[PDB]
Design a protein around this nucleic acid. Sequence first.
RNA 1: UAGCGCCGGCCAACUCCGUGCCAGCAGCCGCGGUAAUACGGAGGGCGCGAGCGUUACCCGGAUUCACUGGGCGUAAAGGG
RNA 2: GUGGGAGAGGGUGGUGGAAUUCCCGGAGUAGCGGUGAAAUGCGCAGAUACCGGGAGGAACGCCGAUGGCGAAGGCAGCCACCUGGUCCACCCGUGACGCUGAGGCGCGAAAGCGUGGGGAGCAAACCGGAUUAGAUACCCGGGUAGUCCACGCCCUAAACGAUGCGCGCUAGGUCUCUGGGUCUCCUGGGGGCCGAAGCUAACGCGUUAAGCGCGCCGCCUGGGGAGUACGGCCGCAAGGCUGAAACUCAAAGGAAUUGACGGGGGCCCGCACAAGCGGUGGAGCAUGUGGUUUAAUUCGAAGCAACGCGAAGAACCUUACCAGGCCUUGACAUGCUAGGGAACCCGGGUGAAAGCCUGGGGUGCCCCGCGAGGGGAGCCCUAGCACAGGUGCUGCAUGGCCGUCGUCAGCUCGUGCCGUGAGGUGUUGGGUUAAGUCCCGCAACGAGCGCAACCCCCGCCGUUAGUUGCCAGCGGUUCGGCCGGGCACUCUAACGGGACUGCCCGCGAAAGCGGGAGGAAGGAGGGGACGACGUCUGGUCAGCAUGGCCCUUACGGCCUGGGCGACACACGUGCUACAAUGCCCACUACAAAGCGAUGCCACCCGGCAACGGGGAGCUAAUCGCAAAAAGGUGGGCCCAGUUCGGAUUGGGGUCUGCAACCCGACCCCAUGAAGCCGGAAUCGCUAGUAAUCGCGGAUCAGCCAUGCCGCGGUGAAUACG
Lengths: 95, 155, 206
Amino acid sequence: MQLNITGNNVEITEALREFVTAKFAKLEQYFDRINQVYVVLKVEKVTHTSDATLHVNGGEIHASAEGQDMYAAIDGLIDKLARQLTKHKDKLKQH
Amino acid sequence: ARRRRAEVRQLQPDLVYGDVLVTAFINKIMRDGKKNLAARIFYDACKIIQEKTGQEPLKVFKQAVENVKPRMEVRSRRVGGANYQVPMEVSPRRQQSLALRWLVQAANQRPERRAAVRIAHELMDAAEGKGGAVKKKEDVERMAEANRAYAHYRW
Amino acid sequence: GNKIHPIGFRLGITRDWESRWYAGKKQYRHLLLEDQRIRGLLEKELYSAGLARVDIERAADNVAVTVHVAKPGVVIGRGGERIRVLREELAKLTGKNVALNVQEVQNPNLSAPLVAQRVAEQIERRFAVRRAIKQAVQRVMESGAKGAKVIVSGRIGGAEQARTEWAAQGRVPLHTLRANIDYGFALARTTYGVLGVKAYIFLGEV
RNA sequence: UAGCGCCGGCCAACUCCGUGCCAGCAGCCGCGGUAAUACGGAGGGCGCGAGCGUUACCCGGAUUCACUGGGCGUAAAGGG
RNA sequence: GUGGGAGAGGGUGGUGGAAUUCCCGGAGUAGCGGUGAAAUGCGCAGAUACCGGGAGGAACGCCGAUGGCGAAGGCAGCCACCUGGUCCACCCGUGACGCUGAGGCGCGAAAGCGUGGGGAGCAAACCGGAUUAGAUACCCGGGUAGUCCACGCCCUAAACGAUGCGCGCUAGGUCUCUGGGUCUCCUGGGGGCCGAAGCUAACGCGUUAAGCGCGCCGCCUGGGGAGUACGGCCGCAAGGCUGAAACUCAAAGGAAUUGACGGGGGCCCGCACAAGCGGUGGAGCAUGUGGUUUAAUUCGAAGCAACGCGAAGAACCUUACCAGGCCUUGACAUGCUAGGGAACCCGGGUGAAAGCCUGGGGUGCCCCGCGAGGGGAGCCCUAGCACAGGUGCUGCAUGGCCGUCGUCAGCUCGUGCCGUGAGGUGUUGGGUUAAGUCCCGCAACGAGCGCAACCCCCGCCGUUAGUUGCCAGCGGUUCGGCCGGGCACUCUAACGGGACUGCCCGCGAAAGCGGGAGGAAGGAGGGGACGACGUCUGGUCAGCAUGGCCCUUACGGCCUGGGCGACACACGUGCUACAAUGCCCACUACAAAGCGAUGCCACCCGGCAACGGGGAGCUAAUCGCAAAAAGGUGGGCCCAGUUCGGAUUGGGGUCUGCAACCCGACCCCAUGAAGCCGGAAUCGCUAGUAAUCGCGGAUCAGCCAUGCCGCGGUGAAUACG
Ligand SMILES: [Mg+2]
Ligand SMILES: [Mg+2]
Ligand SMILES: [Mg+2]
Ligand SMILES: [Mg+2]
Ligand SMILES: [Mg+2]
Ligand SMILES: [Mg+2]
Ligand SMILES: [Mg+2]
Ligand SMILES: [Mg+2]
Ligand SMILES: [Mg+2]
Ligand SMILES: [Mg+2]
Ligand SMILES: [Mg+2]
Ligand SMILES: [Mg+2]
Ligand SMILES: [Mg+2]
Ligand SMILES: [Mg+2]
Ligand SMILES: [Mg+2]
Ligand SMILES: [Mg+2]
Ligand SMILES: [Mg+2]
Ligand SMILES: [Mg+2]
Ligand SMILES: [Mg+2]
Ligand SMILES: [Mg+2]
Ligand SMILES: [Mg+2]
Ligand SMILES: [Mg+2]
Ligand SMILES: [Mg+2]
Ligand SMILES: [Mg+2]
Ligand SMILES: [Mg+2]
Ligand SMILES: [Mg+2]
Ligand SMILES: [Mg+2]
Ligand SMILES: [Mg+2]
Ligand SMILES: [Mg+2]
Ligand SMILES: [Mg+2]
Ligand SMILES: [Mg+2]
Ligand SMILES: [Mg+2]
Ligand SMILES: [Mg+2]
Ligand SMILES: [Mg+2]
Ligand SMILES: [Mg+2]
Ligand SMILES: [Mg+2]
Ligand SMILES: [Mg+2]
Ligand SMILES: [Mg+2]
Ligand SMILES: [Mg+2]
Ligand SMILES: [Mg+2]
Ligand SMILES: [Mg+2]
Ligand SMILES: [Mg+2]
Ligand SMILES: [Mg+2]
Ligand SMILES: [Mg+2]
Ligand SMILES: [Mg+2]
Ligand SMILES: [Mg+2]
Ligand SMILES: [Mg+2]
Ligand SMILES: [Mg+2]
Ligand SMILES: [Mg+2]
């Protein structure tokens, strides 16, 4: 539901909020246990990072990504997040 | 409790009726460590088992124990997707316990405001009669027996 | 960084206070802001001495500020000269009955802060830290130690990524209460930055 | 008359400024994302000298076609 | 050559039984089948389960095996015929007739192909059923080629011992198949296991070599491109054999090592799960935090390790935010150039305060010195400068400090020994323990940082004591321990003494466990403090610190006005509850441990209370906050949104503050709002624990304090596993 955003050290520009929104938006089309997230995006020197904490049913999975984009970690975060949401579902269906 | 057999304590004498397990009852009734206050609504349930079917409270509570007290009960399991409450034989620790627990419990969901009386009626719902006291222990014994279907899982 | 400062741990134990008197309720901060003005004078003033432990005694009106040192002429002066040089703005910082004093140390390299401010020293000098640390403790150990240690921090080659460099020989049981371990600190700064020095002498058992 | 090459490692010759994954280096591993001995200038240093470097090709290092002098269970390699 | 042996070696022809499916008969009734659980499917048109009869195809149970046979592929009911290879004995004959083998030729799992048969079971494709986001799969019900026979093609493979064939030479131990002997033993052939020497990059090989040698054939020469393309040959096809390059890469690789990790496995610890007493979530308020508002709604922190954290005290102070107003060599740091002024006290001008507009009293000084006065050491102001100042940047440039895994049992070194080496060993194994604690093993033997132990609190009694204690003791008592009196008790607070499985039982090899004696206390007696090398590029540039980075009448200082308490919404931690163990009143008990001068303020009087004015005693075991509450005397409530609720709003106060609109808490009086114990989930807790009540402290005018840190009352619910 709620995509919580943290622009600490960053902007969180409305138009980029769109970028980040669409991506988790994709994600939600595969996993229906999700309640809410809080994502925190911050840039330092070269590496422009992103980290979130992700609530599944009661939650929670969490993870972080680097890159020199600030768009990279966006691409990354999802990817790591994805792997662990899939684990979430399987081994669970395996009980 | 992953290491030892986990010892349980030896509770005080009753200076009232002379017995170590009556002191054991005091404490389940009670909250915030009251050996005066919850002790009243059972020490006004001392004079209430003398003022209805009176005799002496002596054997009313020697027979309030084993009377709703289960020797055979459920403790559950799951096999890879199917869960079985399994009938089981409870030891002198579980068999002195199950009792004093529900004693107050179901007796307090009742209407008669003072439990000096409200729970006192419940010492005759065991040693003698019916109620919501003897209500669960049947289902306790009933998931044992009939649903001993699942006792092929035992420890 | 999960340890203790081993001295504040040994106060009333293996070791005693370096300012010890008695005060009253609003009678405290005063005599306290004093000796802390006194080293505040003796820090910048007494450096090339070896400047190690300043043990400060008092009474009403009358405070005897001891100094325990290395080079007692870097201390005393020309016949009387330096000891009463500072003694001017000193009891004239105090405005009370003060007393200047002297004690030289036996193996000044059996004092931590002393031994370390040479590690500090060698460090801004633009010297060999791997060597220096190594050098320092080696000194201490044949010097009659029976255990010894050093820590130093910040950019040890002046490269961006910091480090922490470390060497010790002989027993040094911080966690043991019968200890007698000097600590002393040495803070150095060169054009790449500040550093830090953490030295431990083990002085033997109790 | 004195010049050409180079000074991260191979490989002998190091510091400062400018630049800041840009401009550019590069034979190989690589260097540059703001203190870069690796770019570009400078000071110096090493090398050679009317030359010094680059490119192309030949043998060498290639014991990497193995006569001298290599190999094949799992590295390339025993034929179903 | 003779004589003998074993064998799923091969080809043909026959024949045996079990089981599966189908069909007919009998019998019999409501489900079967199937999965993790289901559903499809089958079934009252009579299934499944049972009996008999019949048909047909495939495979060949037990024997059966690390077994045997073959050159390989590969070969398994039994019988016969036809046939190959092979081993042994005898030492008979031949007389070097040997070995290998480019081409060639033959053989060649399965799948596939052609013509014809056959077709039970199974089963690509295919259809359903479930799963799933999808499921062109995995599991389930069906199901066609195929599987089977004959003949003919196909010619591939992890066609593997990933190891070409023959010969000779170089320890043995063991078991196994199979011949022979004068038989525990030996000798020949075959199949395994461990291993001498040797080999090896290592793993490993080792008389069945991957050792030493010789012969001959095959093959390799970086990865991808690619077993692709082209040509050729073969094939009915599918496709097979032979087999490039361009281009691109700085690697691709083999074995081993240390970790990390596994929906790998073992053994073990933690209130980790279970099991319990209670909570959050759902109520209203506090406080924090997300979003939005604002001109400021100031920064940090952010899963565990941020959300009553930084903040142990925001009315403007604070305060880094913002408006309007100011101020600048500066509010402060040294430093000096050129002067005043030498210091100062008091005004007063415009002021919201600042800030800027300006009157006047006025120097003690080291000296020339009566003196006219003088450098002046002051200090003061004006001009200057260097600069200060910056809570403006960079916690990935740092120190210090701290959070963290975690009070977890570990992290290592010396020297020896193993390995070419990374490295191992130790530190593993076995037994105990809270622990790398100890014990026993053992190519290790020690040692370091950790652990424990040494340090405080608490609990036994002693030591040295008493301006706190005591009819303990006798007595008066103003009958309050008041005093004469008393240092023994309690208190108090410095030393002490001690308890280690020392002792007896059971086990044992030791450590130790199991068990008891006693002891106030035991197997560390219960709590703190202490936290290893390291981890997280954890946190902090806003405590301070520091490399640089940039602002230098502003991004520097001060003031006034406001803000951090806005308010559409969310969450975090919490107090009071939502009632009879309970809601009030009056009656009345019991703790420590603390904190006290424009402080604690005994006591009176006014008042309803807030509190006000008075009043003593205190630097405080001997004065004050001080009343501890829950409980308990026993009285009113009688299931009642209520005598539960203490909340939003109403009034008039009180206090401190210069000041309480924003934005203070307490008082008396009026609103007496939710809230009926709370979903799904989720957070603690193993003794004096949760839980209930009460007191003190920091900080601080005052408190927005229910929070933070502590003190003391009664007293459990649940642990095998
Ligand atoms: Mg060269
Ligand atoms: Mg060189
Ligand atoms: Mg450029
Ligand atoms: Mg860099
Ligand atoms: Mg170069
Ligand atoms: Mg250069
Ligand atoms: Mg050469
Ligand atoms: Mg050559
Ligand atoms: Mg050769
Ligand atoms: Mg080779
Ligand atoms: Mg190969
Ligand atoms: Mg061949
Ligand atoms: Mg072939
Ligand atoms: Mg024959
Ligand atoms: Mg039939
Ligand atoms: Mg076999
Ligand atoms: Mg002859
Ligand atoms: Mg001849
Ligand atoms: Mg074939
Ligand atoms: Mg076939
Ligand atoms: Mg066919
Ligand atoms: Mg056809
Ligand atoms: Mg399907
Ligand atoms: Mg199927
Ligand atoms: Mg076909
Ligand atoms: Mg091959
Ligand atoms: Mg061959
Ligand atoms: Mg072969
Ligand atoms: Mg060969
Ligand atoms: Mg053999
Ligand atoms: Mg064979
Ligand atoms: Mg052998
Ligand atoms: Mg080899
Ligand atoms: Mg190639
Ligand atoms: Mg092919
Ligand atoms: Mg072709
Ligand atoms: Mg065809
Ligand atoms: Mg490998
Ligand atoms: Mg593992
Ligand atoms: Mg595991
Ligand atoms: Mg950091
Ligand atoms: Mg740091
Ligand atoms: Mg070693
Ligand atoms: Mg060696
Ligand atoms: Mg080693
Ligand atoms: Mg280890
Ligand atoms: Mg050992
Ligand atoms: Mg700072
Ligand atoms: Mg309740």
